[PDB]
């Protein structure tokens, strides 16, 4: 219930020719859009921004307008081992891996946050690789200072 | 009223200047749209198609995307004399003609499908001739093989 309201305020939708292709969540002061997500953001002001691209981290960012910084979601660098939250249910972070039940991620849908139990963004999801009953997630995540994209073998950009 | 399920799955709006011009319908494998109906389909998956066109039949068609074929309506070529289901009221077929109570046919509505008493699409309305209280409809229709167009004189086109 509670974290979904944070997601509903954080998320904005990327449309290609009018068709949903992914999302660009406002995190801190960054509009975190994955680079693989085709098309343009639906918000008329987020479409005005100029984005710093990255092929390595598969990520785009820009300073959000000063109007948006109240709506943008809180982040944290803290990723303790345990239980985390996501739109398609709940996530486990263990062994340094975000992991999810098989098929809970779907093509498109990229750019969803993962939240801690306080509703703070901890990662941006890029895809996942199935391993029996569980999939690991391809994820943008970050330390104190830097992004450190995680991307296991056999992953797909769902 | 059971045909309204099939009609509501078959119909897509055709939009111009921010308003409805008429309607397009999934009939068998083809999307049907009248050629006088200006604008574009609301559905991106249809609006991106390229359409084959005839000025004689006043018709534009394309094979619908394979996933949309689950929603497409069952066509039939058979037209017994009798009642037919439709959105603005019970159509009647008599003497080879489609006819309606005057007023049911409104500006636009072109592309609305007419259904037999089995829920099979049998005609694509285009316009109507004033016949007093019992207007008769200009209609695109098909035999077993090719399409054939019905157009009584004095049709107002809509």
UniProtKB/Swiss-Prot annotation, chains A, B:
- The UniProt annotation puts the region (Interaction with spike glycoprotein E2) at 52-57
- Annotated region Ribosome-binding: the residues are 1-10
Q: Where is the active site?
A: 36 (charge relay system), 58 (charge relay system), 110 (charge relay system)
The disulfides recorded in the entry are 10-25
* Site description Involved in dimerization of the capsid protein, residues in chain: 84, 117
In this chain the Peptidase S3 domain maps to 10-158
Protein localization: Virion; Host cytoplasm; Host cell membrane; Host nucleus
According to the lineage, what is the superkingdom? Viruses
Chain location of the short sequence motif Nuclear export signal per the record: 41-51
Name the segments for region: Dimerization of the capsid protein: 80-90, 116-120
Q: How does it assemble?
A: Homodimer. Homomultimer. Interacts with host karyopherin KPNA4; this interaction allows the nuclear import of the viral capsid protein. Interacts with spike glycoprotein E2. Interacts with host IRAK1; the interaction leads to inhibition of IRAK1-dependent signaling.
Q: What is known of its domains?
A: The very N-terminus also plays a role in the particle assembly process. The N-terminus also contains a nuclear localization signal and a supra nuclear export signal (supraNES), which is an unusually strong NES that mediates host CRM1 binding in the absence of RanGTP and thus can bind CRM1, not only in the nucleus, but also in the cytoplasm. The C-terminus functions as a protease during translation to cleave itself from the translating structural polyprotein.
The function of this protein is: Forms an icosahedral capsid with a T=4 symmetry composed of 240 copies of the capsid protein surrounded by a lipid membrane through which penetrate 80 spikes composed of trimers of E1-E2 heterodimers. The capsid protein binds to the viral RNA genome at a site adjacent to a ribosome binding site for viral genome translation following genome release. Possesses a protease activity that results in its autocatalytic cleavage from the nascent structural protein.
- Protein name per Swiss-Prot or TrEMBL: Capsid protein
**Organism per entry:** Ross river virus (strain T48) (RRV)
Q: What is the lineage of its organism?
A: Viruses, Riboviria, Orthornavirae, Kitrinoviricota, Alsuviricetes
């Amino acid at each position: 219930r509670m974290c979904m309201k944070i997601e509903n305020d954080c998320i904005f939708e990327v449309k290609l020719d009018g068709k949903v292709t992914g999302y660009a969540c406002l995190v801190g002061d960054k509009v975190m859009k994955p680079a693989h997500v085709k098309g343009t953001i639906d918000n008329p002001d987020l479409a005005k921004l100029t984005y710093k691209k990255s092929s390595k981290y598969d990520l785009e960012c820009a300073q959000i307008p000063v109007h948006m910084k109240s709506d943008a979601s809180k982040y944290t660098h803290e990723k303790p081992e345990g239980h985390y939250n996501w739109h398609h249910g709940a996530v486990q972070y263990s062994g340094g891996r975000f992991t999810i039940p098989t098929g809970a991620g779907k093509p498109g849908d990229s750019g969803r946050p993962i939240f801690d139990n306080k509703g703070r963004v901890v990662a941006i999801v890029l895809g996942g690789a199935n391993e029996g009953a569980r999939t690991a997630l391809s994820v943008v995540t970050w330390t104190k200072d830097m992004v450190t994209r995680v991307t296991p073998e056999g992953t797909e950009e769902w």
